[PDB]
Paper text:
Here we report in situ structures of porcine respiratory SCs, determined directly through imaging porcine mitochondria by single-particle analysis combined with cryo-electron tomography (cryo-ET). Our structures, with an average resolution of approximately 2.5 Å and local resolution up to 1.8 Å in the best regions, enable in-depth study of mitochondrial respiratory SCs in their native states. Our in situ structures also capture numerous reactive intermediates within these respiratory supercomplexes, shedding light on the dynamic processes of the ubiquinone/ubiquinol exchange mechanism in complex I and the Q-cycle in complex III.
CIII2 transfers electrons from ubiquinol to cytochrome c (cyt c) and contributes to the proton gradient for ATP synthesis. In addition to the apo form, we resolved four distinct Q-bound states. Our results indicate a possible sequential progression from state I to state IV, characterized by increasing [2Fe–2S]–Q10 distances and decreasing [2Fe–2S]–haem c1 distances. On the basis of these observations, we propose a model that outlines the coupling between ISP movement and Q-binding states.
Residue numbers in the entry:
A (entry chain 3F): 24 to 121
B (entry chain 3X): 1 to 52
C (entry chain 3C): 110 to 379
D (entry chain 3C), E (entry chain 3P): 1 to 55
F (entry chain 3N): 2 to 446
G (entry chain 3O): 22 to 438
H (entry chain 3V): 47 to 77
I (entry chain 3R): 79 to 110
Amino acid sequence: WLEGIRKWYYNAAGFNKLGLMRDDTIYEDDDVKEAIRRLPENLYNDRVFRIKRALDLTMRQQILPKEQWTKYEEDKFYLEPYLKEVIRERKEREEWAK
Amino acid sequence: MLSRFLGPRYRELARNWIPTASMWGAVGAVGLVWATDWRLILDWVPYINGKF
Amino acid sequence: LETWNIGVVLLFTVMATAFMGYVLPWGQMSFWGATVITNLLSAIPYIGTDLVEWIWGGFSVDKATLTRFFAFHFILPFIITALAAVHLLFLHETGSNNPTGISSDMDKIPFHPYYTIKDILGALFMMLILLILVLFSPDLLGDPDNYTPANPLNTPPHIKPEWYFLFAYAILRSIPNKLGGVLALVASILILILMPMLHTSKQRSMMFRPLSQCLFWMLVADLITLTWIGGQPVEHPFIIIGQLASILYFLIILVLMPITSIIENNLLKW
Amino acid sequence: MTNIRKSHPLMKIINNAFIDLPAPSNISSWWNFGSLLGICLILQILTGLFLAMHY
Amino acid sequence: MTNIRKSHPLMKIINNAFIDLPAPSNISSWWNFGSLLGICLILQILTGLFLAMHY
Amino acid sequence: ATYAQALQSVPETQVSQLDNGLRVASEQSSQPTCTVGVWIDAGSRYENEKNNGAGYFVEHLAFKGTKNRPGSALEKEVESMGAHLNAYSTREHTAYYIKALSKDLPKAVELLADIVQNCSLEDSQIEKERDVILQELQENDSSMRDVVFDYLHATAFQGTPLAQSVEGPSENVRKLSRADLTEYVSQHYKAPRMVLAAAGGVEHRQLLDLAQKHFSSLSGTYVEDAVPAFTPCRFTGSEIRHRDDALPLAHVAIAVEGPGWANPDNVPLQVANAIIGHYDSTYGGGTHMSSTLASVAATRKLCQSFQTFNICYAETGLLGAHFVCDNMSIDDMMFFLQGQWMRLCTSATESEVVRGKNILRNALVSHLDGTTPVCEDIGRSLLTYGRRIPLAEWESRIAEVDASVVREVCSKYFYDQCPAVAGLGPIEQLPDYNRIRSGMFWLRF
Amino acid sequence: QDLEFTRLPNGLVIASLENYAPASRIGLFIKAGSRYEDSNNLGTSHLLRLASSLTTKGASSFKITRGIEAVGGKLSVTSTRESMAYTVECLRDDIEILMEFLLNVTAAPEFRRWEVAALQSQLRIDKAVAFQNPQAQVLENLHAAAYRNALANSLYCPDYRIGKVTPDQLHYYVQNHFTSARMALIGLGVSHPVLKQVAERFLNMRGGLGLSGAKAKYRGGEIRDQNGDSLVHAALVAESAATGSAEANAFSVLQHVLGAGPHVKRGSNATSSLYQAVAKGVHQPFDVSAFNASYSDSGLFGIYTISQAASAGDVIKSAYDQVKTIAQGNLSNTDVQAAKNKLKAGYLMSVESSEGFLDEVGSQALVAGSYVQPSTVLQQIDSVADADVINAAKKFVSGRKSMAASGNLGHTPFVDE
Amino acid sequence: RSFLCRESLSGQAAGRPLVASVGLNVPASVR
Amino acid sequence: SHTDIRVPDFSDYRRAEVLDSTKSSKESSDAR
Ligand code: HEM
Ligand code: HEM
Ligand code: HEM
């Protein structure tokens, strides 16, 4: 069944080992700048830490111990509600452009 | 390069710039045959052809 | 984007420079490879024939070709330097990309104390391998037939370009059609320009893409296979292996990677 | 008084180029091949010259 | 959103060096030689290459 | 009741003409108030260098005194019924109008007759009036918008009477005399160039019969023979720059030779102008306004008050924009604003043309709200056009113009035409006239 | 073809007049302004007025702006100290569309955090633009120095709240000051049925009356300002009366008895008693005018003066002496008749413009709740007697004063003198 | 704006309470 | 004042077509 495959993929993805949550690995395109800028202060402040710490592990090229890994059930989709709104606004602008 | 660029305003803009772009291509073609001294065109031309 | 396009231009011009430089020593391999590679340009319709003598400077690779190849091989690397300066100029406006892909503007460190010594170490380590190459086995990378005065009366038994060109020679000999061969030669390199468009994965970094990682390493093995096939003469079973490798390379760069990225995003709620 | 490194035109360009450029800390070894390229190019610029004077 | 003349990083230097460069209003012809040098150099580069073509 | 039916209702502008030449024109709908005024056709256009500024002085002294009403007694009457008497003097027209209750219409027309016919022009009031204008000249000097438009007219219509300011140079106002003003009144305040107007609770028969028994004394002849004719003006595309770094902002105005009053090209061009639109830093639309230049300006906080204009005189006009930005924005804005015009000259879209038509319709309809704007429209239209254009005709002309028409008219008036730029203040990034003329054509086209 | 009031069960008086005009104007008037602001949410009303295009529940900011611009409409949010008036006017066969656009921005807003944070900067811009005219500062300081609370609150956000007006304050203000009972929907040129349809369709969202404000008390302060501009804008007022009473009409008549303003451009205000009384005396550029400000629960009658810095001490004195003359019966019936004519003309002429008529109907609906014809207003004005004016003048004279001044205040007399 | 004569001052003296107003495509105004 | 200033006469430099103050430059704009 699907959820097992998504389990396996999340385990093999890597960002769980680095403490990175799923919405931290987004490639920052033009809309994601606005998405991040739209985040509340607390979420922004936790995201910058998570990213900085992950970069620390990567520069040391190590990983967090098994205990402090982001579980699949504990991966909040904090950025997605703002990202979908930004996408909808962009698509509305494109429709008005026609 | 997707459905964004497909729309009535974009089609109309295409129509607006078709004469200019097409005769820009004509400019390019004339410049090319001139620079290359392309006989296979220049022979059919008037007075110019007397060069050969 | 701009850095990538400039890099593609650098690749083109540096490969032309190296081809010409390898023509310079005027060995049998040099002359015959030059003849074959320039004669490839005859495939272009109408005006393809005329370019061949223009580049040749005569009716065959001869005095004028060697002298002009020396002149162009002298000038071009300065063009490479200029384009590299523009490459760095374009890179600076966005900064380097970390392995994680995500923006690292909260973790940037100064270049002078840390990376100057790192690149010193890297350059010295590279010089290590280079000095093993030059000092112990200098002609390890190069056909011995090059150490023979070029003679336009005896084709060498074994004909190849340099080790860094055999990979493209493989696709060249894969396509039976000459014009198709030249177009494949151009496309094998130019396909790097399509790569920024084909990227569909929501992640810009390949650290977190296992399936795409296997695809990438399959592509690397494909390139090495193309090189080895280019080394071997065109006989059974090298011919079919070359065809399959060419098709597989194009198929990976154009189709497998984007489809894998799409199913990838589907697998991760985006 | 101003620091010559960040005030002189050439020194300013070099400083922004490869002195105080903000670079990521987790840059792996694979980025070194950037500089190495130029280094070989420099060497390639150099040795070829010394070849060009006996060719 | 912004003029490409003053937006493109490569176009920045060219625009600030030859297009929107503030120059004195009463510059005589004696300054034109500054261009005449540079242009001339290009011919020396352009011609000198072709001499190197057959030499 | 849709738009068309409401346009049809449009109470009519019945126009008459008494023998001496004065043409009355009223518009009665329901209102208990009224706005009755005359619209003598005069201004800086009909003024030579020696007497430039006489019209402003005459309008100043109009309400001061009359032969019938001795002095401020006229003001006492006007305030007795609560009327708001007012007067404006443009470069072409000078008008006096009284805003008052309809019941007091008989008195208002009598007051207008006294002011416009039996004006004392007394010398002492001239001396006292002299100081007011001089101070008014300094106030207008501080009017950092007005001086820019005066610079525009001076640098565009050079030599011609149109370049002359309305108030006049601050040397004619210090050398004028009763003689000079009396010639101005005699040579300009004549019945043929006079449009008695009213709007509100004003029966057209009432206005006619009042005009016959109050204004018939106006003459139509012109002294011996001297008739001030029309001097056509020339649009000399030029540049004037009053660099004054102390001023905070940098008003700039750029215009090309637009059409005259009679030319139908006003209707398309206005739509095109409505495309560029107007913006102020306190608008609130922000980066969402449909006008591209407004969206750019709000996004990058470029300007503060850019707005287009269509100043249109009898035979020629000014068509362009006036923008107020800081010192380091002008070079950018002259790029964008011009970059907009060429777009209209090359790639105007019916999608935005519909928006422009709607904006023009709303502007025309809303401007004609209230008795005083209606009276202004009547007085101005009977002179500029010769008839009050009904809103239905405006609707027809707006319906005719489309994307092709807008493109054609913009190409005919905007493309490759030498501008008439005029700066003020810390204008230094303001591109040189060569650059501005360079932007007037697009190399893609 | 006539005005038609209608009070739905949840208040929300609905008015409409089919004038058959080419354009129709729909305006929603809300009994919510600065007076209803508290000590902690100061500036919320100004931000709300500046927030008329923010993303609503059913229409994103881009959609609202683009639609209103494409149909060519104007969305004004004209605000007073006790009322806020949204207004959109467009062609007849468009209003429906913008009707929705009016309602979503008044009863179902979202106040997204990013949009409010970005708009916070616009408060400074609006305050700076509106404070260029000295009268704005003087009037705001007058309300601050006259009313203890409520009405004292400025229409503009104080500088200490620029950037700290959280969207939660906006939501609380809307929920407690935009309920159906305290609003009135007026439409000029629209038919009553469709107005009722949209009203009961959406404006029924917030029922009830809402958090009531507190009655303003009269302190009597003398908030002064030495800002340095050459002209000295001074204003001396006192508690006049609440609007909607014989006292209010008498004070309004007294305003025109003393002086209302210019009537003839390039005139001298000969009829105006204040201007002529000061003219004898100060032989310098100056201006004076009676000032009447009638509010829902109170009012302010006084004198506004703009004069040269040194001469100000005379003006505020001389003008005041003039009112003293009217106090002890020095007023003729002819002046009363002239003031009555001026007031009737001013009223009938404010309603000349369609927008002015809309504002009149909105004020009548919000305060009284029952529109009355202009003729009856003229009857009320005429009903004022001379003794009532004489109160009115006594009440102004023998009442606690409130002064506000701005400029070089070296010679400005103090409220005690 | 400069205001330095008896005339230009006339009308500047406000006689009614301040009313502010902003719009969507119109500038801010006061009265 | 702004009224006092004026554009100095340029009649020495003008082209032949645009030299009179009554004609309109639109007629000869195409020619020039
Ligand atoms: C002439 C040879 C070249 C030189 C001297 C050169 C120089 C450099 C240098 C010094 C860097 C920074 C170090 C690094 O990130 O690796 C760099 C980055 C880069 N180069 Fe090149 N380069 C060359 C060829 C290429 C080629 C062929 C491409 C690909 C088409 C390319 C694309 C890039 C990219 C994409 C980056 C950014 C790397 C990152 O952000 O991580 N370059 N180049
Ligand atoms: C872009 C960097 C360069 C590359 C990749 C390059 C590559 C080559 C190669 C592969 C050869 C053939 C060597 C052989 O077969 O023995 C060669 C020869 C030569 N190159 Fe270069 N070269 C470069 C730069 C230069 C420069 C800048 C010069 C001139 C200063 C130069 C001058 C020569 C000469 C004279 C030869 C002939 C000598 C010989 O082949 O042994 N090269 N080059
Ligand atoms: C700085 C600019 C240059 C100057 C001032 C210069 C000057 C000269 C001069 C005076 C000669 C002698 C010509 C004769 O006696 O007939 C010469 C010859 C030559 N130059 Fe240059 N040159 C320049 C640039 C170049 C460049 C860039 C190249 C190579 C690309 C080049 C290649 C040659 C060659 C091959 C010759 C020998 C053929 C001949 O004698 O003309 N030159 N150069």
